[PDB]
Design an enzyme around this catalytic site. Structure first.
Site, short mmCIF file in Angstrom:
data_model
loop_
_atom_site.label_atom_id
_atom_site.label_comp_id
_atom_site.label_asym_id
_atom_site.label_seq_id
_atom_site.Cartn_x
_atom_site.Cartn_y
_atom_site.Cartn_z
N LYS A 1 -24.25 -58.74 4.56
CA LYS A 1 -24.39 -57.32 5.09
C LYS A 1 -24.44 -57.45 6.59
O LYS A 1 -25.50 -57.87 7.05
CB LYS A 1 -25.68 -56.68 4.56
CG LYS A 1 -25.62 -56.28 3.10
CD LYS A 1 -26.95 -55.88 2.48
CE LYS A 1 -26.86 -55.30 1.08
NZ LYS A 1 -28.25 -55.36 0.51
N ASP B 1 -26.36 -56.26 -10.78
CA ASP B 1 -27.25 -56.27 -9.64
C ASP B 1 -28.57 -55.88 -10.34
O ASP B 1 -28.78 -54.68 -10.61
CB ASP B 1 -26.97 -55.49 -8.38
CG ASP B 1 -28.09 -55.59 -7.36
OD1 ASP B 1 -29.04 -56.43 -7.34
OD2 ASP B 1 -28.02 -54.74 -6.48
N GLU C 1 -26.54 -60.64 -9.48
CA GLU C 1 -27.18 -60.55 -8.16
C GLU C 1 -28.69 -60.33 -8.35
O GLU C 1 -29.11 -59.63 -9.28
CB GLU C 1 -26.58 -59.43 -7.33
CG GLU C 1 -27.13 -59.16 -5.92
CD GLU C 1 -26.47 -57.97 -5.26
OE1 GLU C 1 -25.31 -57.56 -5.61
OE2 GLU C 1 -27.06 -57.34 -4.43
N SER D 1 -35.38 -49.87 9.00
CA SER D 1 -36.06 -49.61 10.29
C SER D 1 -37.38 -50.37 10.20
O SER D 1 -38.13 -50.47 11.17
CB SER D 1 -36.19 -48.15 10.63
OG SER D 1 -36.93 -47.41 9.69
N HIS E 1 -32.68 -46.10 -9.47
CA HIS E 1 -31.63 -45.09 -9.20
C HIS E 1 -31.30 -44.16 -10.36
O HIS E 1 -30.24 -43.52 -10.29
CB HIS E 1 -30.31 -45.73 -8.72
CG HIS E 1 -30.51 -46.48 -7.43
ND1 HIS E 1 -29.84 -47.62 -7.11
CD2 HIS E 1 -31.36 -46.23 -6.40
CE1 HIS E 1 -30.26 -48.04 -5.91
NE2 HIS E 1 -31.19 -47.21 -5.45
N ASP F 1 -29.24 -61.56 -2.66
CA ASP F 1 -29.23 -60.33 -1.82
C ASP F 1 -30.62 -60.24 -1.16
O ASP F 1 -30.71 -60.75 -0.03
CB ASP F 1 -28.76 -59.08 -2.53
CG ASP F 1 -28.98 -57.84 -1.65
OD1 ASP F 1 -29.10 -57.98 -0.40
OD2 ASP F 1 -29.10 -56.73 -2.22
N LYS G 1 -17.88 -55.99 -2.45
CA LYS G 1 -18.68 -54.99 -3.22
C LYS G 1 -18.67 -53.75 -2.31
O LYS G 1 -19.32 -53.72 -1.26
CB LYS G 1 -20.07 -55.48 -3.48
CG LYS G 1 -21.04 -54.65 -4.32
CD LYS G 1 -22.45 -55.23 -4.07
CE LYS G 1 -23.41 -54.67 -5.11
NZ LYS G 1 -24.73 -55.22 -4.82
N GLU H 1 -27.65 -52.15 -11.03
CA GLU H 1 -26.22 -51.78 -10.94
C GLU H 1 -25.36 -52.63 -11.85
O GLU H 1 -25.53 -53.85 -11.97
CB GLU H 1 -25.63 -52.03 -9.53
CG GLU H 1 -26.43 -51.84 -8.30
CD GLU H 1 -25.94 -52.27 -6.95
OE1 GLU H 1 -24.87 -52.94 -6.93
OE2 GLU H 1 -26.56 -51.99 -5.90
N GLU I 1 -23.44 -44.54 -4.39
CA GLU I 1 -22.27 -45.44 -4.32
C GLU I 1 -21.13 -45.02 -5.24
O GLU I 1 -20.10 -45.70 -5.30
CB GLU I 1 -22.69 -46.89 -4.65
CG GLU I 1 -23.77 -47.38 -3.67
CD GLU I 1 -24.33 -48.77 -3.90
OE1 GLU I 1 -23.74 -49.47 -4.78
OE2 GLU I 1 -25.32 -49.07 -3.13
N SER J 1 -20.44 -56.98 1.49
CA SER J 1 -21.03 -55.78 0.93
C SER J 1 -21.13 -54.58 1.88
O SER J 1 -21.29 -54.56 3.09
CB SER J 1 -22.42 -56.20 0.40
OG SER J 1 -23.07 -55.16 -0.33
N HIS J 2 -21.06 -53.46 1.16
CA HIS J 2 -21.28 -52.13 1.80
C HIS J 2 -22.81 -51.96 1.76
O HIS J 2 -23.60 -52.78 1.28
CB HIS J 2 -20.69 -51.00 0.99
CG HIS J 2 -21.25 -50.92 -0.39
ND1 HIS J 2 -20.95 -49.85 -1.19
CD2 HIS J 2 -22.11 -51.70 -1.10
CE1 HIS J 2 -21.57 -49.97 -2.38
NE2 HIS J 2 -22.30 -51.06 -2.31
N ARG J 3 -23.20 -50.79 2.28
CA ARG J 3 -24.58 -50.35 2.35
C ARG J 3 -24.57 -48.99 1.58
O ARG J 3 -23.53 -48.35 1.40
CB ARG J 3 -25.18 -50.09 3.73
CG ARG J 3 -25.22 -51.20 4.77
CD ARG J 3 -25.81 -52.45 4.22
NE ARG J 3 -27.13 -52.33 3.66
CZ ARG J 3 -28.29 -52.69 4.25
NH1 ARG J 3 -28.28 -53.24 5.45
NH2 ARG J 3 -29.47 -52.51 3.63
N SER J 4 -25.79 -48.67 1.19
CA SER J 4 -26.13 -47.43 0.50
C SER J 4 -25.59 -46.24 1.27
O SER J 4 -24.91 -45.34 0.73
CB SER J 4 -27.68 -47.36 0.50
OG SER J 4 -28.00 -46.48 -0.55
O1 2PG Z 1 -25.38 -53.33 -1.71
C1 2PG Z 1 -25.75 -52.12 -1.48
O2 2PG Z 1 -25.03 -51.12 -1.08
C2 2PG Z 1 -27.22 -51.72 -1.65
C3 2PG Z 1 -27.68 -52.31 -2.99
O3 2PG Z 1 -26.90 -53.34 -3.56
O4 2PG Z 1 -27.98 -52.15 -0.49
P1 2PG Z 1 -28.70 -51.09 0.45
O5 2PG Z 1 -29.10 -49.93 -0.42
O6 2PG Z 1 -29.85 -51.70 1.12
O7 2PG Z 1 -27.67 -50.68 1.45
CA CA Z 2 -28.62 -55.63 -4.21
#
Ligand code: 2PG
Ligand code: CA
Ligand code: 2PG
Ligand code: CA
EC number: 4.2.1.11
Lengths: 436, 436
Positions: B345, B246, B295, B39, B159, B320, B396, B168, B211, B372-375
């Site tokens: 993303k 990562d 990464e 945001s 984390h 990234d 990922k 990661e 994750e 890639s996914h997100r958190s």
């Molecule tokens: O790839 C992801 O899921 C994370 C970190 O690698 O990104 P973010 O937390 O910003 O979604």
């Molecule tokens: Ca990352």
């Protein structure tokens, strides 16, 4: 008419294989994903596991999948069954198996077909799944009842390190006026709780268990309870949120007594409690904290301890391991006045028909019904439409974390929005949502 | 033709609100659920948050939802846009916003409509989403490429507690012959790893991060790496499984140097590393462990450290935080020969059109693309069809745990099964899956 029945191996939320079924009719493809169950079970429907240690740690479902593809599918297609007739579907399935616990074809093989058919039936009928489930169960439809979600927030017992013997702490937002509001509040409570946990127990304490709650190293019940009360308070929701407990007491029942320090492992046996001493500890917690529901307070065969306790409990008492969604066990429980709410697990019985009947018999005895998720859940949202269809007013589907959990809660958000004025939030009346 | 556009507030896998969009055409209702983003973002598309501390900890998306319902929907319906023309959809959306970072209507408001339309377009076309995505991106279709999943297994850095600064650890089953096999192997590795963790670090160590990986109190990179190698070994998959890292090095970059003990908090500054000393540590780990992908090895603006390293790295280097799916940043990265793979993303850029273009420009420069996914993920499986559509050969999307993760992997299982002989598993060739 059903032209095809197919099963494949997919993955549950714990990374173990589970069965996915796809059923084809002239209206499309209907899918169902079964939650993980028991492959060993006295009194419960047995799910079939491959047992080949060289593949998936011996948890494959390849046999289960074959049963669907090679045994059921062909018999099923040829039978020409009307999917709208759930009982005919389920009777067919059961008759094919031929055992009392579905151990021939597997409860996982059978449930997958049984639920997909219900999706096919609603589609055929041109109604949302919950309306079709309401029709099958003969539930009141004006209005529909949205449930109080019993959110897992903190785990103990076999699910955590620490000395705490009680397995799950839930929060139930009974003071909200809508499902949407209840969910917002529960999430804020949960987030405050995660903050407090990390602050008091370490970064680590914030990781989640299988159902999404935290599992810090806690020593006592009072310690867990005070944390939760702090979280509700910090969220600004004092009075709108109650507590639910899952004691899972079969886990620390040894020698006719209960070991509250069963993780010990030098547990002082002079400290083990009898049913009655245990009941006094529960009464003590019940006087100091807003507990509205206690699941499995006593062991699975400790009939006399449940009865005794039931006489002065005064709150909802949930049967889980005591009843294992087993009709003969339920009837016993009713007869002995052991509790007044059943934890309903559709895969513990194997078919939708038998799940709906188990709930009806509960309702008929004046019991409440809490629809429950399983440890190993999927992206399938079936129990969300089922809880609404059964009008139970209460669901246990995890913490507001991990999408195998949120998928259900998200679905309840859509149902609510869709019903408009035809929906009521069970609120304080969750125990008898059916009678609202 | 599109008759309605609607948005509602639903919940992501972390319990925070997110936007869900439903688009109606004569073929039905198409839905999309957006992952959580930023945001606050220099160089990235901004998602819109309500900021009202009294509701959802200030993370509501009510404004975002209004933007969809009150601003876009009506303009969108009246525009009469053909959903099959993704760029016309996206150009319309962008033009409505009028800002470079979608901060007027919000990237969350815009992405939801942009992805739903693609679902509406495939339906209209009578093809699976991945085929429609292949058409839009002009990808080769004979055969289709199933990706090597880069599974999160263990987390460090910000984390976890412990001293480990690398964020990661992933496992990539490149030696499997199929997506299904790769997934089975990855899950067995993961389960062995969870066993070892609980055995060595305590019951607690087994809880999962956002994750799905474990996050025990680990001190060093070698400690994490040795654990993972033990797990692969215990699973019987030595040689079929590689490692991906990562580093999220922007997190411990301070004063032109890198603090490997940034959690310290009495970190010995004489021990901070320059880009070049850091590169020597990576080379050391790369010689002892089967690492195939790294990464963010260096900080987001440390251009010279990336370049230098890129010259002798010899493995895939993923951008990234260096690129944040931003075209001007990508072009720079390409120009400076800073890496050879982009972490894609879709919500960091806000529309499907711009996501597909960012990947094409990467492919054109000979870079690989990791979807890639997100958190904060959802039950939406969009990135599974997108990775296949883009033919990247690598995704990922988390550990084999938590259904916001498995929903994607489960979807890849269905796609594979559906393609039959028209699908190849990227395997050892994941970096250039596009060119296979
Ligand atoms: O790839 C992801 O899921 C994370 C970190 O690698 O990104 P973010 O937390 O910003 O979604
Ligand atoms: Ca990352
Ligand atoms: O309700 C549940 O999800 C758990 C415990 O309450 O049951 P099981 O682990 O057997 O699925
Ligand atoms: Ca229980």
């Amino acid at each position: 008419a059903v032209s095809k029945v197919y099963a494949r191996s997919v993955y549950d939320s714990r990374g173990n294989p589970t069965v996915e079924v796809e059923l084809t009719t002239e209206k499309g493809v209907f899918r169902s994903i079964v939650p993980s169950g028991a492959s060993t079970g006295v009194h419960e429907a047995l799910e079939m596991r491959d047992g080949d240690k060289s593949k998936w740690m011996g948890k494959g479902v390849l046999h289960a999948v074959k049963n669907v593809n090679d045994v059921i599918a062909p018999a099923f297609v040829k039978a020409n069954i009307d999917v709208s007739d759930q009982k005919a579907v389920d009777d067919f399935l059961i008759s094919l198996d031929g055992t009392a616990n579905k151990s021939k074809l597997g409860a996982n093989a059978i449930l997958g077909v049984s639920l997909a058919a219900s999706r096919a039936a609603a589609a055929e009928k041109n109604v949302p799944l919950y309306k079709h489930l309401a029709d099958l169960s003969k539930s009141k439809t004006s209005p529909y009842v949205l449930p109080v979600p019993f959110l897992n927030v903190l785990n103990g017992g076999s699910h955590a390190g620490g000395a705490l013997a009680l397995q799950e702490f839930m929060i139930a937002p009974t003071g909200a006026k809508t499902f949407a509001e209840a969910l917002r509040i529960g999430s804020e409570v949960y987030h405050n709780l995660k903050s407090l946990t990390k602050k008091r127990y370490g970064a680590s304490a914030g990781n989640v268990g299988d159902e999404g709650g935290v599992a810090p190293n806690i020593q006592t019940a009072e310690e867990a309870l005070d944390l939760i009360v702090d979280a509700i308070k910090a969220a600004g929701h004092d009075g709108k949120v109650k507590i639910g407990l899952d004691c899972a007491s079969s886990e620390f029942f040894k020698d006719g007594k209960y070991d509250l320090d069963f993780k010990n492992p030098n547990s002082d046996k002079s400290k083990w409690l009898t049913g009655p001493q245990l009941a006094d500890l529960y009464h003590s917690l019940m006087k100091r904290y807003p507990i509205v529901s206690i699941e499995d307070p006593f062991a699975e065969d400790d009939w006399e301890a449940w009865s005794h306790f039931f006489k002065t409990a005064g709150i909802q008492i949930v049967a889980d391991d005591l009843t294992v969604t087993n009709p003969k066990r339920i009837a016993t429980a009713i007869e002995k006045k052991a509790a007044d709410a059943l934890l309903l697990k559709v895969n513990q019985i194997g078919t939708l028909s038998e799940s709906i009947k188990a709930a009806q018999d509960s309702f008929a005895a004046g019991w409440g019904v809490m629809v429950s998720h399983r440890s190993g859940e999927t992206e399938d949202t079936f129990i969300a439409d089922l809880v609404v269809g059964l009008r139970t007013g209460q669901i246990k589907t995890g913490a507001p974390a991990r999408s195998e959990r949120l998928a259900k809660l998200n679905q309840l958000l859509r149902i609510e929005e869709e019903l408009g004025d035809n929906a009521v939030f069970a609120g304080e009346n969750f125990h008898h949502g059916d009678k609202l």
